[PDB]
Design a protein around this ligand. Structure first.
Ligand SMILES: CCCCCCCC/C=C\CCCCCCCC(=O)OC[C@H](COC(=O)CCCCCCC/C=C/CCCCCCCC)OC(=O)CCCCCCC/C=C\CCCCCCCC
Ligand SMILES: CCCCCCCC/C=C\CCCCCCCC(=O)OC[C@H](COC(=O)CCCCCCC/C=C/CCCCCCCC)OC(=O)CCCCCCC/C=C\CCCCCCCC
Ligand SMILES: CCCCCCCC/C=C\CCCCCCCC(=O)O
Ligand SMILES: CCCCCCCC/C=C\CCCCCCCC(=O)O
Lengths: 355, 355
């Protein structure tokens, strides 16, 4: 029920290194100096964080495709064409903003992540129903809601616990600081066969702390502050028998965005392989490549090819899970997630950024 | 439900070191050389493993205190005196065997562990009921049963699954070999403030692998071969809010041996502190000191004082868990279990053995 071994990992990586106090060298307010964003309100990161506010205008377009009634100057291919156009400019504008304006790493990462999330929300709004109104602020709650499925009707009318979520925010900032410490003093000295695994041992813990920061801490804080309900935002992916089992429980918001893309809304095409393994993962590869490669300002297509090489890993690991046990299935998931996977998909870009 | 992060730890400590194959130097059948027992059927370990067979004769005595009916030549203090005597000689004979006969470490460890388990089984038989028979082989099943409570009546009338248990035995031998590898190449080079934690980081993983070997693997194999049922042999101790909570779910056999020692069979004395914290833990300290110090053949009383100083940690950590959070309570449990606890309670004796 609780965390358990995560607190063990945190305290043992505190205990391994000699910085037992927050003052490492001198005058450090946190346990690490501010290395994630730093600077101030300057022109380096000014258009990147002002672009995310611009991502509010694309839901505001899409409601004005649907709040415009369908007998009022719009026809049946026109509304789909407007939906495709207002999603495509929504993707293409922050890419141009991040590539033109030279900036840091994390500001581009959060702008691009917000762009991908807003895109998935937009596509889930566009095709989810039958065809001045009474629901004009439903899209303004779905924008800052964790789910990627429209008309949730999940109970907002509840007592907001101002407590617990505050503790969760403290856990969030201290684990982001722990992420920064592991990055600064475990991976940065390495950059300037088994050496790849020696390089990739700390970034697996960095990804584990990333998942604890976003899906358990941040997504529950977001579901609590606007009192969504703190719902199931993932299942037990850490005991993934296969990597295809990993993809269906690491992200319960994205998986419900996939069900319209796989089941009865998309069951009119009747194809097993491309509809689940290729184009549903082409979506995730595009919105991985945009999230990792555009902030580094070099396009080597490594995150895209990493996810597209992780696509045959589904077919290999499901059969290897059927062949071997659920133990060796999870061990081969952890090894294939460590050395050729999502942590290494940011290790390559970090090495290309810091060299 | 599954293991999850344990397979991650196994594969990441495989990936850290360069021995990616079982042939480390030359001719190694396992992934470590045979260092646990080794030798052969020689006179060094001959009386130690022949003493465990002798531990069968003390249940065979105790049934002959109870199959001898209380109207047949025995009175009410005499049966209790016979019970005390046949438990005390049961403890004191393998101590003399291990101390007189100079031998290895693990043979003494398994002899003393069997002595402690047989003692707890004997005490839980002497006082568990009201007062040639029809149940003459019940004590010969309780001897090789995981529980420490008498008259279980748990269903042996079931089909033994020959599968899974075999897989569990393969997991057991490979995790014992992985234990030997971590001991050989992570702790042995260290022996000849933060240096104590640098010494005690691999032994926490060694204890984690010991718990996975004994309580999840070996005890389920034992409960399968005799088709006991593979019952609850521990609960989630890894998310212990306190060490006082850790002691009640690390060992569900020992905890039910403690419930008769605390509740209604032993509630006639009505004392809160000594009946739960001192003399219910003096048992565990004595049968820790017999297990770790007698095989090392030096009596520095370190495991006994380690458990007895681990006793006030219950009183500190219950209030510190009421004060701080369940996250910080688990982190302080993991730190207080790492540096001054059961893994360090074998680290001191291993340092004194290998130097
Ligand atoms: C006049 C005054 C001026 C106006 C003032 C206005 C303020 C301006 C603007 C603010 C933004 C605009 C707000 C508009 C949209 C609101 C959306 C929102 O609030 O959250 C909704 C969303 C969560 O998305 C994120 O948070 C992502 C961002 C988190 C990144 C880190 C960011 C730190 C943040 C701030 C730093 C500030 C600190 C000080 C520095 C300041 C100096 C520089 O939830 C979902 O729906 C998703 C659920 C579905 C999951 C999708 C798939 C899962 C994907 C990934 C898993 C991998 C994640 C790894 C994480 C990568 C990084 C390690
Ligand atoms: C004519 C032919 C000759 C005659 C042939 C006969 C053979 C003679 C004899 C064999 C024994 C006598 C059998 C008689 C009794 C049977 C009892 C039995 O079988 O198990 C019952 C018991 C389990 O106890 C153990 O196994 C403990 C032993 C495991 C130790 C390792 C041992 C490896 C074993 C063998 C090695 C051999 C390999 C080849 C080498 C050979 C060359 C040298 O279960 C419970 O009830 C307990 C549940 C309650 C829990 C109590 C509290 C929890 C405590 C601790 C947690 C910490 C554990 C740390 C682990 C310590 C190590 C790091
Ligand atoms: C090694 C240094 C790490 C620095 C921080 C990490 C930077 C990149 C982090 C995450 C990239 C995106 C991961 C999740 C992608 C899914 C996004 C989506 O599907 O829309
Ligand atoms: C660091 C090297 C490790 C070598 C193997 C470990 C040797 C000792 C292991 C366990 C000792 C006993 C631990 C549990 C004691 C409980 C016994 C009881 O309550 O009867």
């Amino acid at each position: 029920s609780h965390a358990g071994l995560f607190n063990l990992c945190v305290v043992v990586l505190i205990a391994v290194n000699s910085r037992l106090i927050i003052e490492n060298l001198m005058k450090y307010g946190w346990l690490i100096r501010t290395d994630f964003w730093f600077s101030s309100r300057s022109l380096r990161d000014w258009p990147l964080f002002m672009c995310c506010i611009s991502l509010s205008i694309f839901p505001l377009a899409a409601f004005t495709v649907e709040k415009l009634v369908l007998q009022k100057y719009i026809s049946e291919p026109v509304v789909i064409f407007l939906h495709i156009i207002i999603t495509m400019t929504e993707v293409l504008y922050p890419v141009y903003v991040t590539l033109r304006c030279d900036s840091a790493f994390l500001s581009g990462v959060t702008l691009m992540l917000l762009t991908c999330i807003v895109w998935l929300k937009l596509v889930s709004y566009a095709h989810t129903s039958y065809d001045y109104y009474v629901s004009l602020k439903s899209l303004a709650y779905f924008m800052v809601a964790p789910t990627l499925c429209y008309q949730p009707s999940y109970p907002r009318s509840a007592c907001i616990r101002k407590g617990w979520v505050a503790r969760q925010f403290a856990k969030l900032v201290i684990f982001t600081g722990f992420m920064g410490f592991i990055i600064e003093q475990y991976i940065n000295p390495i950059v300037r066969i088994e050496r790849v695994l020696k390089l990739s041992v700390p970034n697996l813990y960095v990804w584990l702390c990333m998942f604890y920061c976003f899906f358990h801490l941040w997504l529950n804080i977001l579901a609590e502050l606007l009192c969504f309900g703190d719902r199931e935002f993932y299942k037990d992916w850490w005991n993934a028998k296969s990597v295809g089992d990993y993809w269906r429980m690491w992200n319960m918001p994205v998986h419900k965005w996939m069900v319209r893309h796989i089941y009865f809304p998309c069951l009119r095409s009747k194809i097993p392989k491309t509809l689940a393994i290729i184009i549903a993962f082409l979506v995730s590869a595009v919105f991985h490549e945009l999230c990792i490669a555009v902030p580094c300002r070099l396009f080597k297509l490594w995150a895209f090819l990493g996810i597209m090489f992780q696509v045959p890993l589904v077919f290999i690991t499901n059969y290897l899970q059927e062949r071997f046990g659920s133990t060796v299935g999870n061990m081969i998931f952890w090894f294939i997630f460590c050395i050729f996977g999502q942590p290494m998909c940011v290790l390559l870009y970090y090495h290309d950024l810091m060299n």
